[PDB]
Amino acid sequence: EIARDTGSMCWASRGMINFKSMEKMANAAPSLTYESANPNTSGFTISQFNILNADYEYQRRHNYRMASYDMTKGVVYSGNQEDPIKFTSNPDPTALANYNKFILPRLDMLVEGNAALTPGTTLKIVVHNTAGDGELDESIPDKMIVMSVTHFEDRFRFVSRAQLGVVN
Amino acid sequence: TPTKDSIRAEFEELVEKDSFWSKFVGSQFVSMLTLFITQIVYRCFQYADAALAEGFISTATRRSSILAAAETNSYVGTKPTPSSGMIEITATSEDAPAVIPKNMPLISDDQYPYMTMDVCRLVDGTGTVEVAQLEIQEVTYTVTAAKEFLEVVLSKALTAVCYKLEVFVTTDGKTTQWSSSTMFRLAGSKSQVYVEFYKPSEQLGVRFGDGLIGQIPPEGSTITLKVWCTNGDITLVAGQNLTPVDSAANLANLISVKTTTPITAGTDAETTEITRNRAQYYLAYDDQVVWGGDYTYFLVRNIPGLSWVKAWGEGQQEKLDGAYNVQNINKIFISGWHPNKSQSELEEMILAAFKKVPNELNKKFSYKEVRKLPFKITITGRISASLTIENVTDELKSALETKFGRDSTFFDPNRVGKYILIKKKDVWAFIETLGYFRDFYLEFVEWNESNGFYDFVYLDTENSTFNISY
Amino acid sequence: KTTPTKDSIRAEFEELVEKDSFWSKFVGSQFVSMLTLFITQIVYRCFQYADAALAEGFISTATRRSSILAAAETNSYVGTKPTPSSGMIEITATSEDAPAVIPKNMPLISDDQYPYMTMDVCRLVDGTGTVEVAQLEIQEVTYTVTAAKEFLEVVLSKALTAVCYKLEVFVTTDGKTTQWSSSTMFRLAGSKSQVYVEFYKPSEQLGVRFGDGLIGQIPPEGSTITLKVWCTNGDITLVAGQNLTPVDSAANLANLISVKTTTPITAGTDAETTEITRNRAQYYLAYDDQVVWGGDYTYFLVRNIPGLSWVKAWGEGQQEKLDGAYNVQNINKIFISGWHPNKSQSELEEMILAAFKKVPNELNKKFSYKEVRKLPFKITITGRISASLTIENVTDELKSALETKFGRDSTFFDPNRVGKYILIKKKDVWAFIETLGYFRDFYLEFVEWNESNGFYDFVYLDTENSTFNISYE
Amino acid sequence: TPTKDSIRAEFEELVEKDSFWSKFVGSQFVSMLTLFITQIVYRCFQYADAALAEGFISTATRRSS
Amino acid sequence: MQRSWFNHRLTSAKQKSLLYKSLADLVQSMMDTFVDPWLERITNRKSIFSMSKEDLETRTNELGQFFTIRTSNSSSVPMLLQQRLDEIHFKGTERPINQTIYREFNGISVLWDPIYAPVDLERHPYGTVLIPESTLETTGGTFGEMFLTSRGMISIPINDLITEEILRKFNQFVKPLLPLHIVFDGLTLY
Amino acid sequence: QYPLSRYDDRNIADPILRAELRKEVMLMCESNDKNLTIYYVLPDEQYRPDLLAYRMWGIAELRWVVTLAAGLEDESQGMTVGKKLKLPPATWIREMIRHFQYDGQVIGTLSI
Amino acid sequence: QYPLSRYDDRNIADPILRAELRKEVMLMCESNDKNLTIYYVLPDEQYRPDLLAYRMWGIAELRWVVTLAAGLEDESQGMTVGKKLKLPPATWIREMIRHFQYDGQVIGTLSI
């Protein structure tokens, strides 16, 4: 609830608890570079990746105009003007304004076991096509944020999987 | 000045003259090619004309070209000013209130930031203080090597909200301000100066100097840019609540509400035409104020909201009122009008602003109060009877009041400091340009000729009488 | 559409062509496609030319050095030129009949294709000499005045402009050849004055222009204009002692003398980068003093005259306030006072007057100088210094520190060389003495203290005459 | 109490005194090496001064010392 | 363009066909006649000495919104523009006045003469006696000490030089260059 | 609607704002980076920058880069045969075009 | 960014707090556990602890352990040829650096 009222992102890992604002995350410079279909790259390499185009599936739940009752002001509104209304309880304008902020997932990828990938990391992604004329894919944005990380080790190989997203 | 017909005629003549095309093919192969080529040539000519017209600053039609020409003649436009007001209520709710805080940040019901300019009083029952929208944000840049100019550019959003700019350079634990300068006019080889500039894309930057005419920021030092951000034109009426933020420990302790003066003194940035005119005048202005119009230009730039000002020297005054006077030597007279300020307040502002005027020495400044002359008209006209008479009268009254009123912009069509008086022909042209009248006549009454120095001739719509028929 | 592609133009042709008996048959064919492509090439050329010219028009958005140079009004320093490299050589003499005196400007080919024009003159005392060489070579171009017109221009070729260090113009009429001096922008120029102005073409070509009859002298109808250029390559170096330079173009001396370098022949420079050129093109008035900008007399005096400890500028009203009388002759007057550490007042008057005279003066104003008046002050100190220290050392260090801080030659009056007068006050002495850690307690007293106007009164400390009373705790 | 200027001047004097560096290589190869060496030496001197200052109890600047 | 650029870009097989070459020449001629001069005008406005006369008129019209100039008075228009733009930096000195007088009057040389006034004000009022600099040393008036007043006199040698026309041209053209606190009081001739 | 190839400089509609991208490309072409290519103008490429653009990169819409680097405003002005040119790769150009089309900020801007 | 190897003692930023880790390592290097290796200083390793570190463990950043165990303060003084050294495995020192880098507490600290 504190995270929702402040507009930040929470995750507890490696002995710390983290609150990071969403507006300042959109202006953060990348730290790593991930490329596909490039064998002369100076960074790392992606072996498998998934493109998700379902942006409505996550925006459907946040398409509402918030309203609430305050004993000294009356009815307090916040948000757009052409969306359906929905009632909450806290009549705090700052809390109402941040009620509809989140991160929209876009891409899932599988790499060769990097242990430096933690949520909150910003990466630069470059994807080339492997047929036709080597055209760059413009449907994947340049900078992405890491949302979830899974590391997996069997008796022969070490692999990592990540989910990447963009701030609305 | 070619047109499609001329292009087609020239093409037909050229085809006729040629030996092969006139003889070996005819009347089917040529006809479509004529139309195609004429169309292509006309399109290309129109594009060339548009580019040539956009080439110069006076005939430019897009803002980017105007901004580039303004950057060539280094010019930075006027920046927005914050709205100001008073919060006379800071009554405490519990014990241990903030006895005397200063620059306490506040937020007001729309997530807009405000802060208090002076310390509050001991708030025995309540305390009075004034507030402004100003907020402060900083950005820092380290230096890896001496690039001999080292320009630093802010972001688009930060340049959108900007009021002042302050530069600090930190070297081996010591930090100092660096002053600004106009170009590099009198500094060299040790002076700590910088020059501001505006990119064709709306970004504001700071340029440090060369080794000979400036001090390059030494390697291994941090440059800090401090920006005062303000939204342009926001008004909050009265009785609204302001809650502290950051310093939020006092929110439970205190109560702050809006009362007395609302915040209404905001101002936005320049428009395109004002920038176009001021960039051209900046060439003649330089920074020296020797000529007559330079004082008006400086006053208009520094003080916001003025309609018109005029300045005259000793010769004009001696030709006007007194044959000769020793006291008139090296004296400058100023007169003006401000819609929302009294003449005494204007006088208070003028000499206070003139303390920083360049090229000031052996000079004495005076102010002369303005005299207003009503002026009046009478019209007799015939309408086409499709429109009602009352609607025509009301629309004409509103249009005349907006165009030729005291608060109108006719006296300074552009913000460049100038006094443009009202002539009879302007009324005749304007009333016709609207076009309600099939035929009309004007008679001017109580019209007085203006000196042009301290006379004022506006138009009074209420006293004027309109005669409409048909 | 503003951006014409091949497909759009072919579509336009197909749209126009229909409803025609002959042409509608060939709508889908290779011939129409080839014709449309061949036509679209011209449209592309015209659109791109217009856009590129519009972009390159302004100095701010120009993308090349040549366009910035062409648009720049001045060039004196807007566009830099290569500078030659220099070094020292030694001239041995082999056999007899070698010249007694080596000629000046003796061309010397290096190990590589590098010419070396020895400057100065050389004398072989016993067959050994030493001179300087300057890496550059002198070529010449000539031109004839076939017709006399306004703004006559003579343009060099690209290769010569790539390596141009100096330019000298000689115009000969009848049997007399005379050099013509250059001018910035025909400043103070008129008829009977022979001047020329340089310019830079959009292509890399330098030029010379003589303009008009009123403000310049057109070269006569029957004269020949000759340009002489000194050619050099900047960043070329030769090692010391490993190189032999045979004589060329005066090959009579090749067998007689042997020449070998002694010091490395280096330190040449090259042309500037485009960004530096544009920045210098916007602000060149900065480099050379022309006028007193913004009416800042003290700053100008500080810049032109180095070492001025302090200087102040008056006004008629301020003098009126000082003397308390309305006027004696104080109209259209500018008063100035100052002090230099190591020169007399009259010499300072002469320097200030000359420096102001060099720059053009304002209208109907005359300068006057006021000589400074010296009012030194002294202090007396009584205090204890603890038994650990020595009285004599404490007194000596106190005297030296006080003289450095407050003194006639001190920097207290303008710690920064921005022109400001700062006056000594009583609190400063207490604070400065307190910052030093010698004294457990002291009680300062001021003797001969005066209240000084900031205009022409000088107050400073005289350490030697001051008395110090220091006793052990 | 060295500064960057003193370091640069001493390096220039040392280079000029040398027989090989002064004669065989000139004015392009040397200039950037001078800046690099002076910067490194100044950094090392500053670190050594900080350690020496932190050495004693009276002049210590960190709690652990 | 050049005299056979567009024609030369055809393939070698089509260049020997008559109709294609003729069509290419016709298209190039049309484009040269109707389009090229405006592009050349765009590209030739970098330097003031290379512009056409219409662009010079445009720049002079831009300059005329703040000063009063007539281009037929001087020998050349680019010289007028460049010199005025250069003398803008010398605001308030004698240089702009002297150079403008020399430039716009076919070579007349002048010297600015300031005016002096007496100090004894109760016996001589301020504006009854006024002396130029040339007659200051050779005079018998005011019987006392002098001081400088913000007024001026123009001195013209008759050799280079009719007075009324000179006064008219001066008042119309050069007087606006004077500072606001300086007063002009006619001509003097020697 | 007629789509413009992704390698065209006309992708930015304003001729004044395109000047920044052109300045960046020209500044890179004159540097001494380690992944540039050196190409001399051949005798048959004097008036045809498209042939050079096709021979170097394999893309014909990159003729504006060749015209820019050579130093001409007009395509009908012949290049000097044998002039040494340094030209960057194609992915770099595409990335710069995308950055200036969708963001449009100076390379060294400071943001918060 | 330029990180540090996990075998570097500089991972602890305070030169005084590194004393605990150095003391523990030196105390181990003088003991007689069963996991210790005996290594003599060869004639070519007199001035080069990096060569000894590479030859013993395969990691070159462990030269501070070799400098510490010999009893020297700088690397510029030469070690005595033929001095017997005992060196522990790399994992132990690596976790020891991590211990004081993170936990920092002294071995044997009593907690509740």
Question: Alpha helices, DSSP H only, in B29-89?
Answer: 29-55, 63-72
Say if residues E173 and E73 touch (Cβ distance below 8 Å).
yes
Dihedral sign from CA coordinates of A23, A27, A31, A32 = positive
Calculate the CA F18 to chain-centre distance.
12
Strands B152-154 and B204-208 come out as antiparallel
Closest by CA position to B250, among listed B95, B411, B47, B129: B95
In angstroms, rounded to a whole number, what is the distance separating the alpha carbons of residues E152 and E175?
11
CA distances from B462 to B337, B402, B427, B459, B465 (A): 21, 13, 16, 9, 8
Beta strands in B276-330 (DSSP E): 308-312
- Whether B359 sits inside 8 A of C295 (CB atoms) is yes
- Start-to-end Cα distance in chain B: 46
Round to whole Å and give the CA distance between A82 and A168.
Answer: 18
CB atoms closer than 10 angstroms to residue B365: 16
Q: Are C281 and C68 in contact (CB under 8 A)?
A: yes
Instruction: List all residues 6 or more positions away from B417 whose beta carbon is below 8 Å from its beta carbon.
Output: B293, B295, B296, B297, B298, B299, B300, B308, B309
- Distance CA(B339)–CA(B342), nearest Å, equals 8
- Cα dihedral across residues C410, C413, C415, C418: positive or negative: negative
- Give the whole-angstrom CA distance, residue C246 versus residue C254: 6
Which residue, among B72, E85, E47, has the nearest Cα to C207 in the 3D structure? E47
Which residue from B minimizes the CA distance to C285? B185
Q: Are B333 and B312 in contact (CB under 8 A)?
A: yes
Cα–Cα dist F18/G52, whole Å? 60
Separation of alpha carbons G87 and G68, rounded Å = 11
- The C-alpha atoms of residue C201 and residue C208 are separated, in whole angstroms, by 11
- The whole-angstrom separation of Cα A117 and Cα A145 is 11
Find the helix or strand (DSSP H, E) in which E121 lies. none
Facing residues of B12 across strands?
Answer: none
Residue C172's Cα: distance from chain center in Å? 33
Look up residue E17 and give its DSSP letter. S
Residue C273 DSSP symbol: P
Main-chain dihedrals φ then ψ at residue B301, nearest 5 degrees? -65, -45
Neighbours of B229 (CB within 10 A): 19
* CA–CA gap between residue B420 and residue B408 (Å, rounded): 12
Nearest Cα to Cα of residue G13 among G100, G72, G107: G100
Residues of E in contact with F76 (CB under 8 A): 1-2, 5
Residue B245, CB half-sphere, CA atoms under 13 Å: how many?
Answer: 15
| CA angle centred on B265, ends B261 and B268, rounded to 5° | 155
Structure tokens at C278: 């544009």
Chain-centre distance of CA F63, in angstroms? 7
Q: Could you tell me the CA-to-CA distances from C215 to C186, C189, E69, E82 in Å, in that order? A: 7, 5, 19, 12
Residues 6+ apart with CB under 8 A from E60: E69, E71, E77, E80, E81
Produce one character per residue of B428-446: b if its CB has 16 or more CB atoms within 10 Å, e if not.
eeebeeeebbeebeeeeee
Q: Do E149 and C71 touch (CB under 8 A)?
A: no
Pairing state of beta strands A48-51 and A74-78? unpaired
* Radius of gyration of chain C from its Cα atoms, rounded to whole angstroms: 37
A51: enclosing H helix or E strand: strand A48-51
Helix axes B272-285, B63-72, angle to 10 degrees: 20
Residue with structure tokens 């400044």? Answer: B365
Residue with tokens 């190989």: A157
Backbone torsions φ then ψ of F82, nearest 5 degrees: 95, 5
F60 in contact with chain C, both atoms CB, cutoff 8 A: no
Cα–Cα distance, C86 to E162 (Å, whole number): 63
- Do E5 and F47 make contact, defined as CB atoms within 8 angstroms? yes
**Cβ contact (<8 Å) for C55 and F15?**
yes
CB contact set of C77 (below 8 Å; sequence gap of 6+):
C280, C284, C287
Helices (DSSP H) in C337-442: which residue ranges?
Answer: 345-358, 391-405, 426-435
Q: What is the Cβ-side half-sphere exposure of residue E38, based on CA atoms within 13 angstroms?
A: 22
Is residue C409 helix, strand or coil? Answer: coil
10 Å Cβ neighbour count for B404? 20
- Token readout for C357 is 């005279």
Question: What span, in angstroms and rounded, lies between the C-alpha atoms of A69 and A71?
Answer: 7
Contact B64, B235 (CB under 8 A): no
> How would you class B212 by CB atoms within 10 Å of its CB: exposed for 0-12, middle for 13-18, buried for 19 or more?
exposed
Deposited resolution, Å: 3.2
Q: Is F14 on the interface with E (CB under 8 A)?
A: no
Task: Give me the residues paired with residue A44 across strands.
Answer: A34
Beta-carbon separation of B314 and E33 below 8 A? no
Q: Does C48 touch chain B (CB under 8 A)?
A: no
- Beta strands A16-21 and A8-13, pairing class: antiparallel
C379 forms bridges with which residues in the sheet? Answer: C446
Do at least 3 CB pairs under 8 Å connect E with F?
yes
Rounded to whole angstroms, the Cα distance separating E5 from F77 reads 10
E5 in F contact zone (CB under 8 Å) = yes
Which of A142, A143, A166 to mutate to probe the F interface, most F CBs <10 Å? A142
User: How does DSSP assign C36-92, residue by residue?
Assistant: HHHHHHHHHHHHHHHHHHHHHHSSTT--SHHHHHHH-S--TTTS---B--BEEEEEE
Please answer whether residues E131 and E151 qualify as being in contact, where contact means their C-beta atoms are separated by less than 8 angstroms.
no
Mutate to test the interface with D, among G10, G14, G74 (most CBs of D within 10 A): G14
Can you read off the two tokens belonging to residue G2? 């330029």
Please compute Rg for chain D using Cα positions: 17
DSSP H or E run through B89: none
Which residues have CB under 8 Å from B343's CB, separation 6+? Answer: B369, B370
User: F: neighbours with 3+ CB pairs under 8 Å?
Assistant: A, B, C, E
Cα G107 to chain centroid distance, Å, stands at: 18
Strand partners, C89: C131, C261
The span from the CA of F48 to the CA of C4, in Å, is 20
Residues from chain F that touch A27, judged by Cβ atoms under 8 A, are: 111-112
Q: What does residue C134 show for φ and ψ, rounded to 5 degrees?
A: -135, 15
Do A and E have ≥3 inter-chain CB pairs under 8 A?
no
Strands (E), F1-112: 37-40, 84-87, 109-110
Question: Cβ(C172)–Cβ(C224) under 8 Å?
Answer: yes
Total number of residues shown for chain B: 470
Smallest Cα–Cα separation from G92: which of G15, G50, G14, G34? Answer: G34
Yes or no: say if B75 and B284 are a contact pair by the CB < 8 Å rule.
Answer: no
- First CA to last CA distance, chain C: 97
* Locus of tokens 């920074």: B287
Whole-angstrom CA distances from G99 to C41, C111, G3, G12, G110 are: 72, 66, 19, 10, 16
Rounded Cα distance between C136 and C265, Å, is 12
Distances (CA, A) of B362 to B470, C454, E19: 66, 18, 82
Give the gap in angstroms from C-alpha E94 to the nearest C-alpha of chain C. 7
And the tokens for B331? 């004296």
Asked if F87 and F56 touch (Cβ cutoff 8 Å), the reply is yes
Strand, coil or helix: what is A125?
Answer: strand
Q: Which residues contact C293 (CB under 8 A, 6 or more apart)?
A: B182, B185, B186, B287, B288
Check CB contact of B351 with chain C, cutoff 8 Å: no
Within a 10 A sphere around the Cβ of G35, how many other Cβ atoms? 8
Task: Give the whole-angstrom CA distance, residue B334 versus residue E180.
Answer: 13
| Contact yes or no for C217/C61 (Cβ under 8 A) | no
DSSP H or E stretch at residue C178: strand C176-179
In terms of Cβ atoms closer than 10 Å to its own Cβ (0-12, 13-18, 19+), residue B384 is: exposed
What single string gives the DSSP state of each residue in C421-443?
-----HHHHHHHHHHSSS-SEE-
Residue E140 and residue G17: Cα distance in Å, rounded?
97
Q: How many residues does chain F have?
A: 112
Asked if C439 and C352 count as a contact pair (C-beta separation under 8 A), the reply is no
- The DSSP secondary structure of B166-230, one letter per residue, reads EEEEEETTEEEE-EE-STTSS--SS--EEEEEE-SSS-EEEEE--TTTS-PPPSS-EEEEEEEE-
Q: How far apart are the C-alpha atoms of A89 and A91, rounded to whole Å?
A: 6
CA–CA distance, C259 with C124 (Å, rounded to integer): 12
Encoded tokens for F42: 């051949």
Contact at CB, B32 and C16, closer than 8 angstroms = yes
Cα gap B192→B194, rounded to integer Å: 7
C95 touches chain F (CB under 8 A): no
C-alpha torsion sign, points F100, F103, F104, F110: negative
Which string of b and e fits F63-84 if b means at least 16 CB within 10 Å?
A: bbbbbbbbbbbbbebbbeeeee
Closest Cα to residue C87, out of C269, C261, C270?
Answer: C261
Backbone angles phi, psi at C34, to 5 degrees: -65, -45
Kindly tell me the burial class for residue B26, based on how many C-beta atoms sit within 10 Å of its own C-beta (0-12, 13-18, 19 or more).
exposed
Q: Do C191 and E102 touch (CB under 8 A)?
A: no
Amino acid in position C303 = R
Question: CB–CB of C50 and B54 under 8 A?
Answer: no
For residue A84, CA distances in Å to A62, A87, B110, B381, B433 come to 11, 10, 21, 55, 48
Q: How far apart are CA B141 and CA B120, in angstroms?
A: 36
Q: How far is A161 from chain F (nearest CA, A)?
A: 27
Q: What is the dihedral of CA F80, F81, F87, F93, to 10 degrees?
A: 60
Per-residue DSSP letter, C271: P
- Which residues on chain B are in Cβ contact (under 8 Å) with F99? none
Whole-number Å distance between alpha carbons of B331 and B7: 64
Which residues in chain F are closer than 8 Å to C3, comparing Cβ atoms? Answer: 4, 10, 13
Instruction: Quote the CA–CA distance of B48 and E42 in Å, as a whole number.
Output: 9
Minimal Cα–Cα distance from B203 to chain A, Å? Answer: 17
DSSP A53-74: ---HHHHSTT--EEEEEETTTE
Cα–Cα distance measured from residue C302 to residue C310, given in angstroms and rounded to the nearest whole number: 8
Answer for the pair B404, B457: CB distance below 8 angstroms, yes or no.
no
Tell me how close the Cα of F102 comes to any Cα of chain E, in angstroms. 30
Question: Which residues on F lie below 8 Å from E32 (Cβ)?
Answer: none
Q: What is the number of other CB atoms lying within 10 angstroms of the CB of residue B331?
A: 16
Amino acid at B374: P
F window 30-89, beta carbon within 8 A of E: 47-48, 73, 76
Query: Chains meeting G at 3+ CB pairs closer than 8 A?
Result: D
Contact (Cβ atoms closer than 8 angstroms) between residue B453 and residue B364: no
Task: Report the alpha-carbon distance of residue E117 to residue A150 in Å, rounded.
Answer: 96
Q: How many angstroms separate the CA atoms of E89 and E91, rounded?
A: 6
Distance CA C443, CA C383 (A): 7
How many residues are given for chain D? 65
Q: Three-state SS for E63?
A: helix
Residue owning tokens 């916001």: B304
Residue B99, Cβ density class (10 Å: 0-12 exposed, 13-18 middle, ≥19 buried): exposed
Burial (Cβ within 10 Å: 0-12, 13-18, ≥19) of residue G37: exposed
Q: In a 10 Å sphere around its CB, with 0-12 CB exposed, 13-18 middle and 19+ buried, how is residue B225 labelled? A: buried
Question: Which two tokens mark C390?
Answer: 């020595």
Instruction: Give the separation between CA A124 and CA A129, rounded to whole angstroms.
Output: 17
Question: For chains C and E, what is the number of CB pairs under 8 angstroms?
Answer: 100
Residues 6+ apart with CB under 8 A from C317: B362, B364
What is chain E's alpha carbon radius of gyration, rounded to the nearest angstrom? 29
- Binary contact (C55, F22; C-beta < 8 A): yes
Of chain C residues 192-231, which have a CB less than 8 A from chain B?
Answer: none
Q: Tell me the C-alpha distance between C36 and C10, whole Å.
A: 6
C-alpha span between B160 and G37 (Å, rounded) = 68
